Amino acid sequence: SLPLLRPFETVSLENAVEDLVVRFILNVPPEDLSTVERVLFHFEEASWFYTDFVKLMNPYLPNLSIKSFSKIVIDICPLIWNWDITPENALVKFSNYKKTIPVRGAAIFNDSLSKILLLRGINSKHWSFPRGKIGKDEDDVACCIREVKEETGFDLTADQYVERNMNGKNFKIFLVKGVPEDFEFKPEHKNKDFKKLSKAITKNLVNSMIRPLSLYVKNEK
Amino acid sequence: STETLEIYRKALNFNVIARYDPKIKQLLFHTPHATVYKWGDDNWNKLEYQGVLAIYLRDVGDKEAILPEVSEANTPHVLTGHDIYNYGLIIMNRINPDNFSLAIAPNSVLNKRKLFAPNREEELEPMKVEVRDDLVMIKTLKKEVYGIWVHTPEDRQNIYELIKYLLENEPTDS
Structure with a gap:
């Protein structure tokens, strides 16, 4: 007050x-x-x-x-x-x-800045950024574009990330602004509005990085 | 070193809070784990404020000082007007950057104000506190009814009796 x-x-x-x-x-x-x-x-x-x-x-x-x-x-x-x-x-x-599973993904944004790119799994009825497991001696930025090639199919191409540990998994989601909203994304492997997401989370992994993602939105404008 | 730590704790807390409320004078009380609940929908709502609780003394002070500007029933009612509020309450947040606050001014100065100089910048209803259902019930100046939690029942009365002293007594220097 x-x-x-x-x-x-x-x-x-x-x-x-x-x-x-x-x-x-x-x-x-x-x-x-x-x-x-x-x-x-x-x-x-x-x-x-x-x-x-x-x-x-x-x-x-x-x-x-x-x-x-x-x-x-x-x-x-x-x-x-x-x-x-x-x-x-x-x-x-x-x-x-407390041996963690580093999961590399990204919070994809539009040039006008109004929408976010989240996908829903085959078994899961939960929406999240393209999230998949890492490998051996590979840069966190190279595992990021490769996992976005496996789950959506679009490499974008460093320091602008959003770290957080969630139940023994080190999620280090990078921030990339500027990807075409008209482009058709499809899974290369066998087997929403930001305005609409702010009002939805307020009623009490993406469910936790709402406020840092709102700070990326408040800033770029 | 076990005592050299608590004196560094008073130092760090103080000049960390001085950057938030620039009008601190004396840090009076600090507890390490508080949580705020609000009343309105005939039940408690877990508010997004959780961290160290602190009760300080404000330098009020240079009369004619502005309560400056930072950037429906769910949102708080920011105090606007003259810097006339004698003590402060603050939960140093861990959830998000914005901390929690309650201006605690005695009823002793309110009745002194409301009758002598009726130039009320904001409507102010005197504060009251109690110990109920493992929470410290706080009735604010702008009618808002909050509740603060601490695990220890000793700590819950500790902050209550102090808040109670502050409002029932006249402006002090401990």
């Missing part, structure tokens, strides 16, 4: 981290601070909020992966990291003991 401003869209990366610290890391019961596995999840949690909101509010900020963002929180606020091992080293041995 009280009118508080929007300082994320105008402040330093040093400050943006500080905020996110208050938000996700620092105000927590000691249990979630005296255990490595726990704070590595709150870093996971704040890196997503950074990539899905902070980066989208302030464009002068760089695109940060959980790899580097943690390195940054460790430097600006070194009071939270008590232990001797490095985060990079820890979030591999400990957090990624």
Whole structure:
């Protein structure tokens, strides 16, 4: 109710981290601070909020992966990291003991910006971006266009992604604006309006990235 | 280091909130996991605000100061007018960037205002609080009825008795 401003869209990366610290890391019961596995999840949690909101509010900020963002929180606020091992080293041995399935897809948009490209499965009556499993030693952007060739059939061709972990699957959906809306897409393998989607989700994977996708919409205009 | 941490917590919280409400003076209370529920459809609605709760003191202050501008019954009623509100409530969100807020001004200053200078920028009905159904019931200045949750029943009364002191008492400096 009280009118508080929007300082994320105008402040330093040093400050943006500080905020996110208050938000996700620092105000927590000691249990979630005296255990490595726990704070590595709150870093996971704040890196997503950074990539899905902070980066989208302030464009002068760089695109940060959980790899580097943690390195940054460790430097600006070194009071939270008590232990001797490095985060990079820890979030591999400990957090990624929770072995994830990286799924590469994309949120497809039109040149006029009014519609999104989501498909429905054969068995599933649920709408989502072209989502499929990864491989060995291949760039996240090359697995993205290849999976959009298998499920729709149109390669588009980097840092503009939307990371999120959902029940042991690392979804890193990239953002591509500018694909023909008239073009006919068909499955190359054997076996909606944005206005219409905003009103529908408000009534209480794409069901979670509504607000970051609305931030991609509010910005480009 | 276990105590050097809580003093850094008061520092970080404060100047993080100072960037949100620029009129803080003294951070009075902070709890680590709150959730807001709203009343209207004769039942509670889980609002999209979840994170650390904080109750602070506002520098009111430079009289004639603007309550500035940030960017149907479901939307809140933003306070517009003069900066006259004595204390603040804030849930530092984790859901989306916009945080939660409640202006908490005593009835002691309201009755002092409403009678002496009847130049009310916004209609203000004095605030009241209670402990009901594992939630802290808060009746706001713009009639809005909210409810804040915390797991501990100790914490629920803690924030209640403070909110209650703030409104039933005169502007302080602790």
